[PDB]
Design a protein around this ligand. Structure first.
Ligand SMILES: [Fe+3]
Ligand SMILES: [Fe+3]
Ligand SMILES: [Fe+3]
Ligand SMILES: [Fe+3]
Lengths: 455, 457, 458, 455
């Protein structure tokens, strides 16, 4: 047993994918309640959870897992594994990362960074796939392996929300509040800093297996070796470029374009002579045409809010989130009740069970709650889905299927009413054949499950 | 001496380019006062000026000019010249590919084809001057086309355009119909229309036979249509401006910069979105009762409103001035601007040798910008550049943007030169530190053709 | 369980040389026919049938059950990995839904009449990979495969010819094949695949036969073939294909532009000006001209073209082909013993919070040979020397870029000896190098890359 | 008048464009016979023609012409005009427009002036080059060089084109040298600059006077220096850029291999399975006799390639490239009078007059000139490429062709092959009258054809 294997068996038994995302996150920070965490701590404060349980994460990832993937899997330096010694010197021999070369670099003082553990570990995959569903943002991970008595990286801050889960050994972390207003919730990663750049840490602790450390983007952090032992931790990262400003970036051009098409005031010609009083050379001119020009800009910018296509941009963001998502991890029930667990197979020179079909009696809901998004584009409707994504980020292009207007209302019904079962024959389409057709298309793609297995 | 010829001779005597762009525009719409035209009619009303003077434009452009350019210049179908006819409500284009010889052009004319010259300012020094001075009081590029229509025919279907149009009737006559924007969306239209049918149109707001000397103006979005009757041909020149010179176009450039500035400088724009906003935002949720939607939409409007504060208005103005400089026709110099500038220097080869090689600028030399609408200072990434117009081609965008770096020690003297046209300043009185820097700026600008001197060097 | 295939695979594991095991595996492929006879008389010349009289011959290579398992456990895609098609009354249909090919979809297609073809079984099957990887080594050319599964009472494909050499291994069920001599001189050893033909424009088959599990059918590029499933049984075969664009012409296509350039640089006759007026008697409008200057001109073309042979960089072009071949190659399959004697097998592992068995290096006394004989090639380009290798290639064709490492002139002569002396062990101290550091660094480099094994495990 | 104005007046009355190209080249090198020149000197020997007539080129180009073009045309530094002094060569080009004030001031400071495209701005240089290209079979370019008094001359070097220097004004001491090694004979590329130590005795040393001509093959080193304290002006005519037996072959051989592969099975046979065992740089000293056989076979096959060479198609491609490189033709008074360009159609008093006489079957025709068009087979169709819309600026225009339909091919071939014989349109080898008139009219309208009497 282990608290991790225990929460996973529980996850396997929770019917809603939405609820199992909430449960897993609750586990991640236990005993702190998530509502308190998100309202008071998320994006505001560094958080230490002292677990008092070295066993908490057992089974998530281990140095033994890393050793195994080095030999059994096609781990490449640069692409998958960084080896670094500390200024920062990257000792990446080009090519395959063999145990021989990796472990040799480690004995010589290099830290090992696995860039994509979810690509090679079914457990990390499941972990990130369920968690992405309650962030609404891609969730990545790196695993870090630090040898005994090695110098630590320079202090710096990142552009993502970080959760560090201490897996093996011990490490002394120092984290710092943003040092100036500009660095609070920073837009981009920092350069490396000198000790003399830093204030006092807001948080300093020796992390032990099972512990958790969270800090927002813009919080400087630094870590060093302890007690003559090694260190392994997994870092979980989210909220890359998931800002009110990023939403605004997409909204604005569309809003100006809408205001122009729909309001004459936006289509009126500039003054013939605004170049006489606007421009850097005129920055302290006391010309009242300049004051009037400025006001008119502010008035029009302000009115643009009425023209903001918020819903269409929400949908484009949802489309990109689908494209960024890890593919889903099916429960045993979900598998059994879907195309994936359907007993059609080759058996003694022939297939068996071919012909199993949906009927109007079949009861139906989406496989999971975070696998699909209906998006209207250039007059047409497309259901984008995650079920064919690779465990490698953007390895695949975005996948969709066209949803026809006769079946649009049924689709929104399915998306809106998970995990409630609905009869195929109760789907709001104009025809029986449109009901079956939508149901079959979705089931075949792996987007749907049936209340009982087919035939 | 035609009125066109008198105003040009008059222009030659006006020292300020700013003042002569005003004077030509005044002449163009005479007797209507420009102040009245601009406050009430510009972008609002179709406008007819009945000149009462068949000679008003004599010398600007004529069918003979067209004829000789066809035989003496490399005039190409498609690129330079269109042949078109609009028979029975249907538009057709009859450009045989390649060079447009008189033989081919005049034969298409006899077959009922209108001929349209796309860039008369490339082939005519007077259309060039005309546009080059007018562009200076529009603050916007001024283009033109010439239309030659054979008797008893129409070249073009009814449509509206995306520019401000002034038609000058040059020869013969033509019956024009111009229509109010037919719906609020077509008012000051953003793009040119498709060809319409008669069925699409209401009653013209203006219907008139144009005669030589007459002017017709109408805003973008006004549908128009023109017809040769009696038994006479027509020739007109259409002057176009204000392409994409809209407040919206200004906003289009300003907003991405504003958002970026807002994000660098104010944490509210850097806060994370909600983890669950996709549950209540998006097309499938427009019906939603969910109070979180109302809050979300409010936040959008608040933040959008705050962008005003972050809008780099002066920088985008400077960027649009750069583009305008890139768009401009090169200047037409008056006799005395020539005589006083590098252009009218007597240095020449004569009898096996260069003569009159002796002249340089001194601290005593008095100096101002060659003209007032030929150059613009712009700050690009910690550097300073003077963009100018004097080497632009008469052909639109043939030349790439032209500039020269102005160094920090020269910046204030440059701003002064620009800000004080047409006031002569002594080179030695120039606000630099060094005698060297004062003289260096002056020689650079002079040699480049941006600067004139009080007396010939 | 035992099968002739499993038996030969075990035999291969005991042959030290990779060259000898490629020879042995190909010998098994066509047994009892001797290879020498096959290559001298049949290869590129005649369709060949091997009646095996042994339904178990291939057992262990690939099966429909294997295909089922790869469809369910692997991300097999329609179009890119798998085609579903039916050849009906003479005309081709292609029924690929887009996206993932699940067992549910694949088998429904199969029951509705569709043949299935898997385009790169070697990506998903370890045994097909090994089979192909050793075979490539004695073809000197990439060996690919497809797997074809045909439902009872059906044909998958119209009659056509191909642009590769085909060995068809009948794996399950039976199939009636017809193969035809090239119909016209132009189609012999054809350069491109034909369009689909009608039965009407074919002659008489040169070979017509029901294939049975264990049989092999070989025929050259340009031979039309057609295959019918009968008697309510299905068919499964794997087609092995090689010799794509591996032609004397292809070699010439690369040698000639280089030779003209060399001729121009080195010989003034190729730098002399053309006649000022050759366009008066040369060109399509002059094909019937009686001008003698036309005759002189064409004689001159012929004379100069013939001289180009003396200027042909034949070796540099051979090396560019070996490079491309290294790039097309499947990664190698190591024998138990090769693993044990290479970087891949040293006992460095993570045990109880630390690495164990770390550091056992190479001495001047350690004995050494190339890991296998068809995994690297030394290529000089632009005044530098590179060792292109195979061991980091993926089993997906061209998924990875060409991989190399630089060899410095101080190491060149030793590299040649290692490439040239396989599988004879050479002591590191014997490597023909200036220094002793140069002997160790080279040896260490190759070993660390997986290009070299040691007589005794380090 | 002058010898140049005389030969130009003469050209005006020679009816054949071919015969005028020949006549002008005779003039260029008079009293040297063209036959002797091409037979024994061209590409073999430096040639001096001491003319004894300072007046010989008067009318071609002058410094006074340079001066008006600096004022009346939009001449640009870099693009049209270089100013340099010599090392090495120091370029003193200001960027942008080359005004009289800037060019003359650079000259007076000791810079030489090089005009790159005189044919673009001089009508008589245009004619000179346009007629001369027609008997070279190769683009004829020119530059004009103005050298101030007492200026240090350029470094010795050789070029990759055939050069004729025409001394226009003043005087210049030229030294020219035989190619110094086999590899420099008829060199493929221009050399770097040499030092005086690298050279020996000039094969040709002379002070050029106005009217003189100096010719030397590509590969001959040359240098010039100031004389007698006077300025110098000369025009250099260049041709035969990349017009070599090797350049022809370069185009022939890829297509020959391709054809041999399509047409003969020997080229379609597989390489040996193990050639890599004895071919390649590792094996240059292999004793294996399989290497000997492999070699012989390459030579044997390379030798058969000559039977497959599409000589004619490559001829036509080089001809199409020459058509594209060519200057537009200069029409005689008669050629203009008898063609579309000479039709009297004009605007007079509000109307076109003299409009549209038509070609009939009775009209006698021939091609406008002999080197203005080429009939080329491309992708199963026929195109007539032509020169008459080319710019006086090199490649300013793309290739111009008109499609010629199979029904009109014989008649087009006849017209191209019978210049300057007149033929009745009715006697054109077409199956119908429409096709005869259709072709003639098409050619006439493009400016490709003249009529025996004006229409
Ligand atoms: Fe960090
Ligand atoms: Fe219009
Ligand atoms: Fe086939
Ligand atoms: Fe030279």
């Amino acid at each position: 047993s282990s608290p991790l294997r225990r929460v996973l068996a529980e996850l396997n038994r929770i019917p809603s994918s939405r609820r199992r995302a909430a449960r897993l996150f609750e586990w991640l920070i236990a005993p702190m309640p998530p509502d308190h965490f998100y309202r008071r701590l998320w994006e505001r404060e560094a958080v230490l959870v002292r677990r008092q349980d070295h066993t908490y994460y057992q089974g998530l990832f281990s140095t033994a897992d890393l050793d195994s993937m080095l030999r059994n899997e096609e781990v490449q330096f640069g692409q998958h594994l960084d080896a670094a010694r500390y200024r920062r010197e990257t000792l990446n021999p080009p090519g395959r990362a063999l145990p021989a070369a990796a472990w040799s670099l480690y004995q010589a003082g290099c830290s090992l960074r696995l860039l994509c553990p979810q690509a090679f570990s079914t457990t990390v995959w499941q972990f990130l796939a369920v968690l992405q569903e309650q962030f609404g943002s891609m969730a990545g991970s790196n695993v870090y392996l630090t040898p005994p008595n090695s110098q630590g990286f320079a202090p710096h801050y990142d552009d993502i929300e970080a959760f560090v889960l201490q897996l093996e050994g011990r490490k002394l972390w120092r984290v710092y509040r943003p040092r100036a207003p500009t660095e609070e919730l920073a837009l981009t990663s920092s350069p490396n800093f000198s000790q003399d750049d830093l204030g006092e840490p807001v948080l300093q602790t020796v992390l032990e297996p099972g512990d958790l450390l969270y800090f927002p983007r813009g919080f400087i952090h630094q870590a060093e070796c302890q007690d003559g032992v090694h260190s392994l931790h997994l870092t979980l990262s989210t909220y890359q470029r998931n800002t009110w400003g990023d939403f605004l970036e997409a909204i604005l051009p569309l809003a100006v374009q809408a205001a122009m098409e729909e309001n004459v005031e936006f289509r009126r010609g500039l003054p013939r002579d605004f170049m006489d009083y606007m421009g850097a050379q005129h920055s302290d001119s006391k010309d009242p045409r300049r004051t009037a020009f400025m006001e008119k800009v502010r008035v029009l910018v302000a009115r643009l809010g009425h023209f903001a296509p918020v819903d269409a941009v929400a949908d484009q963001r949802a489309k990109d989130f689908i494209h960024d998502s890890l593919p889903p991890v099916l429960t045993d029930r979900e598998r059994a009740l879907s195309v994936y667990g359907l007993p059609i197979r080759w058996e003694a020179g022939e297939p068996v069970n071919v012909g199993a079909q949906l009927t109007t009696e079949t009861e139906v809901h989406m496989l999971q709650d975070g696998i699909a998004r209906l998006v209207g584009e250039g007059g047409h409707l497309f259901l984008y889905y995650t079920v064919e994504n690779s465990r490698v980020y953007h390895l695949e292009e975005p996948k969709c299927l066209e949803i026809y207007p006769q079946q649009a209302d049924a689709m929104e019904l399915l998306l809106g009413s998970y995990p409630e079962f609905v009869r195929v024959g109760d789907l709001p389409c104009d025809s029986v054949e449109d009901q079956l057709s939508l149901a079959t298309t979705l089931y075949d793609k792996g987007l749907l499950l049936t209340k009982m297995p087919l035939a």
